[PDB]
Amino acid sequence: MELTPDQQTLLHFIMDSYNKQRMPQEITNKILKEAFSAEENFLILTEMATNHVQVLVEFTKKLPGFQTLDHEDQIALLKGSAVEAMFLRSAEIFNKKLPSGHSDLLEARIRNSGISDEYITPMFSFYKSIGELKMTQEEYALLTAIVILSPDRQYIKDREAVEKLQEPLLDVLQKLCKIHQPENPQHFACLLGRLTELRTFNHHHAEMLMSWRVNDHKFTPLLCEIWDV
Amino acid sequence: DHQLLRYLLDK
Numbered sequence: 001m002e003l004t005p006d007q008q009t010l011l012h013f014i015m016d017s018y019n020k021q022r023m024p025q026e027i028t029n030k031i032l033k034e035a036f037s038a039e040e041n042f043l044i045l046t047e048m049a050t051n052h053v054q055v056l057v058e059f060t061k062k063l064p065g066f067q068t069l070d071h072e073d074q075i076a077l078l079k080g081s082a083v084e085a086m087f088l089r090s091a092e093i094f095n096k097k098l099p100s101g102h103s104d105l106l107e108a109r110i111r112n113s114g115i116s117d118e119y120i121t122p123m124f125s126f127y128k129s130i131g132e133l134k135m136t137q138e139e140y141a142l143l144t145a146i147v148i149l150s151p152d153r154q155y156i157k158d159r160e161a162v163e164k165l166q167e168p169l170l171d172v173l174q175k176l177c178k179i180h181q182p183e184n185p186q187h188f189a190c191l192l193g194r195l196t197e198l199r200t201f202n203h204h205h206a207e208m209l210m211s212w213r214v215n216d217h218k219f220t221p222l223l224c225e226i227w228d229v
Numbered sequence: 230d231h232q233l234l235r236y237l238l239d240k
């Protein structure tokens with residue numbers, strides 16, 4: 001029932017890799033410090049996302065067995081997960097406990113950033129529903145690894161090789177849930193259910209980006225490839 | 230194509 005020495009090892013190693021990301025406080029201090037125009041916020045988003053993808057690629061290469069997969073399957077797994085991982089990490093940041101009144105200003109700054117009304121509602125519904133789950137740092141790290149190692153991605157040639165890498169992560173996540181929240185037995189199924197919500201963000205992503213209230217939508221060359229814009 | 234992605238993954 002408890003984590004085996006192997007599972008604790010995999011867990012601590014996943015956590016250390018995940019924590020090499022840009023710190024939440026760094027992101028929120030900037031946003032909370034002062035109100036920027038839509039033009040400036042779009043520039044902040046593209047620089048944040050470029051750095052996120054760069055760190056995501058590094059975290060992915062350290063996932064056990066990923067480097068043994070077919071080079072074309074590796075590209076499809078990364079391209080297919082980059083948007084979901086950005087929204088999952090943004091939800092983590094959004095839900096970080098801050099001093100009284102700060103998270104309300106954060107929500108106000110994000111609502112007034114330049115994103116269109118059509119995309120604010122599903123975005124905030126996701127962040128709140130993530131918030132209710134009260135996820136630990138390990139749950140966010142394992143869930144990100146599970147999102148990346150999704151065997152059921154379009155343009156994947158060898159699905160079982162991916163399934164074999166994801167299954168030990170699913171098993172660690174389940175045990176973690178059955179220990180951190182014994183009073184909520186659906187917690188594990190409910191985390192996995194939120195992944196189905198993340199997939200919908202990826203399908204309308206190009207449209208969400210182009211509907212930002214700016215005069216010109218400039219992207220970096222790495223984002224052009226990853227976001228298909 | 231995805232040449233920047235291919236590069237980052239190989240490197």
Ligand SMILES: O=C(NC1CCCCC1)[C@H](C1CCCCC1)n1c(-c2ccc(-c3nnn[nH]3)cc2)nc2ccccc21
Nearest residue numbers: 041044045048049052086089090091093094110113208209
């Ligand atoms: O910087 C940010 N997100 C980074 C977080 C770390 C991983 C990489 C993305 C943006 C802010 C940009 C500047 C203006 C306010 C939002 N952000 C988002 C967010 C995310 C995507 C779109 C978007 N739009 N079109 N495609 N994606 C929009 C907003 N939600 C956040 C919740 C908490 C904290 C920051 C948040």
